[PDB]
Every structure is written in structure tokens, then in C-alpha cells.
Design an enzyme around this catalytic site. Structure first.
Site, PDB file in Angstrom:
ATOM      1  N   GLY A 383       0.812  -1.199   0.000  1.00  0.00           N
ATOM      2  CA  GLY A 383       0.000   0.000   0.000  1.00  0.00           C
ATOM      3  C   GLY A 383       0.849   1.254   0.000  1.00  0.00           C
ATOM      4  CB  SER A 384      -0.113   4.825  -0.209  1.00  0.00           C
ATOM      5  OG  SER A 384      -1.334   4.625   0.476  1.00  0.00           O
ATOM      6  CB  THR A 385       2.277   1.959   4.404  1.00  0.00           C
ATOM      7  OG1 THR A 385       0.882   1.972   4.723  1.00  0.00           O
ATOM      8  CG2 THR A 385       3.082   2.163   5.680  1.00  0.00           C
TER       9      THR A 385
END
Length: 640
Positions: A383-385
Site C-alpha cells: 500500500g501507500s505506506t
């Protein structure tokens, strides 16, 4: 030599036939029954091997040091060392003797009872005594039991003490309405094929206090494997099941009526926990009196195993998921200890190991959320993490200027018109975006542009300094993380997607905590650790210390800024540096956007704890940040 070579071939086939468990094929290679020939007939040799090798669970007969000479004109003498595996271990160094027979052009073995075991003579019997070893326990970092063997309250019914007619209907209703059991199942259990009128048919296991026993009900305390945390640690610990006839065939050293681990740590540590079976395998005289002992050793119980898990953090992390699909990993990022490995939804390991119906088992495997999956060991897109890693890589190679401001107009962006109808999408329409703003608002277009500016070569050079491709040293079955399917993206779109944690990335939550640990060790990656006594393993200089002391101050703002994506965590009033993130997956079951919510958070002051949570295929208005309030409070108080 013309027949001495054919004699060695007969001894090789006879040993092989005994090794493959086909005793009839071995018996047909013997001479007729006589005094100077074989001591028994065809079926007599068969039944002797099938009884003795069957009772001792003999498997894997292999020989060595074979020597065949020539005693008489039609008799050759053979000898060899041999070893075999039995219920009590290995029979190393067994001296076998015997004579062959070269009648006509077919060499046979003058069979004698000494070919079963060396010092057997005539009507010698074989006995085997065994004492089962108790399975070892699994404890947490503070000694709390996670998987122990104790006494269990067993609820059952006796059909004779129920009622002849009409009274039995009221008691079955009185027992079903008093122990939380199905009213139609109490009648089905007392009407099976194995049930007799005066038998004791088991039903349910009482977990806590026991209510009053109606007419026909009774409790009988039995022993069995008990899991105190229950479903809160089912995927990690696992469960044990009955040992089947085919399980003994693969490993004869298992207890014929014991328990074997079927999944999780109960199976990965099945050898260290089951112990070793004690007893004696002796040859006795015809009258039943002892004669010669072959194998004997005392029963050795299983050794306990201490984990880095915290039983309180394990239950809190699991309950915070509220039964939704997801996972949570909590670590001490400076040492690598895994404090909690939660996976939801889950199954009941106590109901699993203590008799489970095939209807409830079908509900587990037919559940679309799949409670049997260990989600902390399943590969996902981070994810955008992942924008932290791509930013840290961008700061090391000088591609990303923390103070440079890109001008992004709108919510969708594509490089050139060659991308077709694909565009990187963001949620906040911020016109002036620098690095600090991109981490606060979680801007995908910023890192998508900075990744294409960085290039594929410089991106992978920074990515290869992590744990991509490495197999972690953990007793948990998992696949190594990958950057993509192949060694090259061969696509600007795939390169941009990999920038903000999409594309073909596959990293399980445990591997995520390992990579993200560089922000709690000044750029040094600390490998995760599950066993308490293990030594801390690290990987220094993964990212520069300059990039860490630049992103971590911004990660504080993801919580403290009023427009930060993790601003709801500022209510805790504790020093927190976090980073949210989402990932859109396109599954084919129901063609619609399945979105996964991610949260990474740790203490930036003492680096005492680190947390990575995920919500798989999240419901609307749900997120991992909404549920991490409880676990973050516990980890902040007990792991400073």
C-alpha cells in the site's frame, strides 16, 4: 563368481522386499521347509514378519558390508550389517547371518528365525512395551501458557439414565437449554452407530464454571491440549489432531495413540514438543520369559518453547480487528521480538482439537474471509505506506529534495498520453506538494512522479538493500518478498505503481515490520525474532541516517497535523510517528474495488514498540487507524 554374484543378488532382493513392506514377495525367495533348509513354510514366514515387523513398526531396512562366500557345493553363506527404524528408534549395527541354496538355476535363502532379529532361535517371541511422552508446552515471553496440556471438563449424556419415553424428551430439552447446545444434536449423538444403551456419549466441553446437571447429564474430567488464548492465536499456534495409521507409516517414532501438530507452531515444532517414546523392545523365550533386549530407553517428555509473543498484546491486537479480515504485527524494533501476530477472522482451536463436527468445519473452509489463512505470513501489496521506503531511497540518491514543491493540479495524473486511460489517483487536491505534504496527506501522485524521475535503476539499487528475495529465519511458513514478477518492470506505469506500494509488490506483514524497522534503528534493518532465546540479527546501512532523521519528523506530523491521515491517534496523547496507506485490488469474484487499509506506527522517542496493521477488503468508512487506539496504548505503557 558365476553363482556368488547371483547369490548376492538374491540377498539384495530379499532385503529390498522386506524394506518395501512386501513380506510375501520376500517369503517366496526362500527354500522349502526342512531341517537343512527353511524353518517355516510360505505363509508361516509371511505371518511372522507381518506380526513382528508390524508390532514394532519396522520401517526402512537397509544393509551394508555384504559378504557372500561358499560353504558347501550347493550352499553359500552370507552375512551383512543392517539397520532399521522402529517405534523406539534406530537399530544400529545388526549382524545378520544365514546360508543360501543353489539348487538348479534359482538361488533361495535358507530362512531361519535369525533373519527377523539376529539372536532369535526357534519359537522365540518378541515383545514391545511403550510409555507415551507428554507434549511440551508453548509459553510467551513472560511464561503465560499459550498451548498447554491440562484437565478439561467433559459434558456427556447416558441414554439409560435419560427416560424410557417422554421423560427423555424433556431431559434433552433440559440439557440443551442449560449448556448452550443444539437441541437436535443431543438426540443425534445418542443415536449413532457406535452408541449402546448404557454408554456415555460425549457432547460439549465446559470452558469455565459448570452449571447444574439435569437428568442424564454428567461430567468426566479428561486431559487434552488446551489453548488459553483460543482464536486470538489460532493461526500462529495451530492445533493438534489424532495420529492416523498413515502418520505412523511416515514416522514410526510417533505415539500410536498420541497427538501430532497439524498447523502453525504445533506442527513446525512437533519434534521438539512431542518428546521421545520410551520403552523396551526385547526378544523373549518360548515360555514368555525375557532373553535379549534390543532397544531400551526411558521416556523423555517434550521441551517447553518460549516465544517473544505477549499474551496480552496478542489478545488486544486480535480483538481490535473485531472479526474483520485483517492482521496486526507488533514488534520491539530494536531487538526484533515479535510481540503479537494476530490474524482475523479466526477459528476455535479448542473446538478443533477436541472433536469438531464436519458442519462447523465446512463453515470454516467455506467462509469467504477464510479464517484458516495466516494473514501475517501472506504476501500483500504494502500500500501507500510504502511511500516511506521510496522517499528514503529518493533522499539517499539525491533525487528527492525535501523542500522542492511540485505543482499537482487535480486528483488524477498521468505521465504522457501513452498511458491510455490510466492515471495515478490521490484523495486530497493539494496544489503545492513537497515531501512533508506528501507524507501528511498521503499523496500518491507526488511519489509516482518522483519515482519516474528517480528511474528504475536507482530505484532498484535502493530497494535491493532490503530483504527482497531473502528467506527469514522463522518457524512460520512464508514466501520471500518480491519487488515484481521479473527483474525488470518494463513499464513506466508499473514503475510508478511500485513507487507508492502497488504494482507487483508482495510483502507479508512480518517482512513489512522488518523493512520498516530502519526508521527505529537509524537506518539499520533488524530481522524479526520469534523464539525468545535467539540472537538479535541485523543488517546495517540499509538507508542513510540523514533520510531517517528527515522522514521521522514528518511521520510525527501525520499524527499531529490536523489534516494528517492519522490525526485521530493524537487523542492518545503519546509520542507517535505513524503513516497510513491504502491499496486497491481488483478481484474477479465481484468486479469492484476491493481496498485494503494499512497503518504503520511506532514510538519515535524510545523506539520501544512498532506496529503494522492491515484491514483486508475493508468495509466502507472503516480503517486500520480507527482500531489501533487500544493496542498503541498498551505497547506505549509496557514497552518504553
Amino acid at each position: 563368481t558365476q553363482a556368488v554374484e547371483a547369490g548376492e543378488k538374491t540377498v539384495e532382493q530379499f532385503v529390498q522386499a522386506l524394506n518395501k513392506g512386501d513380506y510375501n514377495k520376500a517369503a517366496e525367495m526362500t527354500s522349502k521347509k526342512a531341517a537343512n533348509k527353511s524353518a517355516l513354510s510360505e505363509k508361516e514366514i509371511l505371518d511372522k514378519y507381518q506380526n513382528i515387523y508390524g508390532a514394532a513398526d519396522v520401517k526402512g531396512l537397509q544393509i551394508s558390508n555384504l559378504k557372500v562366500d561358499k560353504k558347501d557345493d550347493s550352499t553359500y553363506s552370507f552375512s551383512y550389517k543392517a539397520k532399521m527404524n522402529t517405534s523406539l528408534g534406530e537399530l544400529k549395527d545388526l549382524s545378520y547371518k544365514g546360508t543360501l541354496d543353489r539348487n538348479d538355476g534359482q538361488t533361495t535363502i535358507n530362512w531361519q528365525p535369525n533373519l527377523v532379529f539376529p539372536e532369535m532361535e526357534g519359537n522365540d517371541k518378541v515383545s514391545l512395551t511403550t510409555q507415551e511422552a507428554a507434549r511440551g508446552n508453548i509459553i510467551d515471553r513472560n511464561g503465560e501458557p499459550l498451548a498447554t496440556t491440562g484437565k478439561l471438563k467433559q459434558l456427556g449424556v447416558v441414554p439409560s439414565k435419560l427416560g424410557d419415553g417422554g421423560e427423555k424428551t424433556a431431559n434433552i430439552k433440559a440439557i440443551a437449554s442449560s449448556f448452550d447446545l443444539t437441541e437436535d444434536a443431543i438426540n443425534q449423538a445418542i443415536s449413532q452407530s457406535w452408541v449402546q444403551p448404557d454408554y456415555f456419549v460425549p457432547l460439549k466441553i465446559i470452558d469455565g464454571a459448570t452449571p447444574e446437571l439435569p437428568a442424564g447429564a454428567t461430567i468426566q474430567e479428561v486431559d487434552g491440549r488446551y489453548y488459553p488464548l483460543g482464536e486470538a492465536a489460532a493461526q500462529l499456534i495451530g492445533y493438534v489432531g489424532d495420529i492416523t495409521a498413515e502418520d505412523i507409516d511416515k514416522n514410526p517414532e510417533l505415539s500410536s495413540n498420541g497427538k501430532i501438530g497439524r498447523s502453525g507452531l504445533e506442527m513446525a515444532f512437533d519434534k521438539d514438543l512431542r518428546g521421545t517414546t520410551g520403552g523396551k523392545l526385547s526378544i523373549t523365550d518360548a515360555d514368555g520369559v525375557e532373553k535379549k533386549v534390543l532397544i531400551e530407553h526411558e521416556v523423555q517428555n517434550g521441551k517447553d518453547i518460549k516465544l517473544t509473543i505477549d499474551a496480552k498484546a496478542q489478545k488486544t491486537a486480535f480483538d481490535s480487528l473485531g472479526g474483520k479480515a485483517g492482521s496486526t504485527v507488533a514488534t520491539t524494533p530494536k531487538t526484533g521480538d515479535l510481540l503479537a501476530l494476530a490474524s482475523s477472522p479466526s477459528y476455535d482451536p479448542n473446538k478443533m482439537t477436541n472433536g469438531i463436527s464436519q458442519e462447523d468445519y465446512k463453515a470454516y473452509e467455506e467462509n469467504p474471509e477464510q479464517p484458516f489463512i495466516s494473514r501475517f505470513a501472506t504476501g500483500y501489496a504494502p500500500g501507500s505506506t510504502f511511500k516511506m521506503i521510496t522517499a528514503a531511497i529518493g533522499l539517499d540518491n539525491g533525487t528527492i529534495d525535501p523542500n522542492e514543491v511540485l505543482t499537482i493540479n487535480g486528483l488524477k495524473w498521468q505521465k504522457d498520453s501513452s498511458w491510455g486511460s490510466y492515471q495515478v489517483t490521490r484523495v486530497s487536491d493539494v496544489s503545492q506538494v513537497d515531501l512533508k505534504t506528501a507524507l501528511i496527506y498521503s499523496d500518491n501522485i507526488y511519489m509516482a512522479q518522483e519515482t519516474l524521475k528517480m528511474g528504475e535503476k536507482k530505484f532498484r539499487i535502493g530497494l535491493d538493500k532490503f530483504i527482497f528475495g531473502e528467506d527469514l529465519d522463522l518457524p512460520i511458513s512464508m514466501n520471500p518478498a518480491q519487488i515484481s514478477n521479473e527483474d525488470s518492470f518494463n513499464s513506466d506505469i508499473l514503475l510508478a505503481d511500485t513507487g507508492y506500494g502497488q504494482g507487483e509488490l508482495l510483502i507479508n506483514p512480518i517482512q513489512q515490520a522488518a523493512m520498516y524497522s530502519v526508521f527505529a534503528n537509524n537506518g539499520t534493518l533488524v530481522y524479526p525474532k520469534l523464539i525468545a532465546d535467539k540472537e538479535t540479527k541485523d543488517k546495517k546501512n540499509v538507508i542513510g541516517e540523514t533520510a531517517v532523521q528527515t522522514i521521522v519528523p514528518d511521520l510525527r506530523e501525520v499524527v499531529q497535523d490536523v489534516n494528517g491521515t492519522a490525526h485521530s491517534l493524537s487523542a492518545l496523547g503519546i509520542p507517535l510517528a505513524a503513516k497510513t496507506g491504502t491499496a486497491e485490488i481488483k478481484e474477479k469474484q465481484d468486479v469492484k474495488g476491493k481496498e485494503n487499509s494499512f497503518l504503520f506506527a511506532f514510538n519515535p522517542d524510545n523506539q520501544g514498540y512498532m506496529m503494522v496493521s492491515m484491514l483486508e477488503n475493508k468495509e466502507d468508512d472503516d480503517s486500520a487507524t480507527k482500531r489501533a487506539s487500544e493496542l498503541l496504548q498498551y505497547l506505549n505503557q509496557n514497552y518504553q
